[PDB]
Design a protein around this ligand. Sequence first.
Ligand code: EQU
Ligand code: EQU
Lengths: 124, 124
Amino acid sequence: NLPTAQEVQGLMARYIELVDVGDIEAIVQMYADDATVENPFGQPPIHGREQIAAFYRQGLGKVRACLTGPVRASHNGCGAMPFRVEMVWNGQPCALDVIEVMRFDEHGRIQTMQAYWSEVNLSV
Amino acid sequence: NLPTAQEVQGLMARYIELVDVGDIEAIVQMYADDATVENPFGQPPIHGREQIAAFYRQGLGKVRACLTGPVRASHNGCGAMPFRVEMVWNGQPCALDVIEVMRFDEHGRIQTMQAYWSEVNLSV
Ligand SMILES: C[C@]12CCc3c(ccc4cc(O)ccc34)[C@@H]1CCC2=O
Ligand SMILES: C[C@]12CCc3c(ccc4cc(O)ccc34)[C@@H]1CCC2=O
């Protein structure tokens, strides 16, 4: 905990900006060294900056990301947000609806991220 | 951890429907008998149907609720959804934006629920 409810809304909106531009290195600097990511939730986790970097380089190396509603934030450093990811799959233009939950540490870095989505949230 | 992702989407949308109509009986029964709920997340857990039913008894005891986006569903019995609650803050109508994350058991009942929101999500 520590970042405020207001700080958490901003940190999370910023994360979506970076994904939308595709600035891979800025994204990764947002995560704690030790951060763990579960994306999609239900999969073995990604542990550490290095492994986390790999996901973004591979997934983000023509993708667009837009928040589709307000960031919901608590007072113990956690937040949840709904967004859409636009991409192209084998020529097929797709959109994926996702909801992510994040826990920030005292330095304002992402310690934990979990993403909720599956094929049922895939759209053409 | 057994309803399918499509089943999760349906269970969760039903729950918003019952909340909307105020069917407190039907809601409580959606929960496991020893389910735990954190609403708001950050607040200590209310446990077991009796305690959970008290939340809905008094909370919903001119409240409207509606999904404001698709229910995101995983493959391990978890789902997350964005919705808004409309109530009255003494005299004036306001709205609250919430995101809830739910885990279901083999019986299709809510074993856990976490509600993400704070004052930053309240608009008059
Ligand atoms: C990897 C991916 C692109 C980006 C992306 C996906 C899923 C969840 C995400 C969550 C994020 O916080 C940021 C980016 C993604 C997609 C799944 C299919 C695909 O092409
Ligand atoms: C109790 C309440 C009405 C309903 C409600 C609130 C907060 C979270 C909720 C989560 C639910 O899954 C269902 C209903 C609510 C509101 C807080 C202020 C208020 O009037």
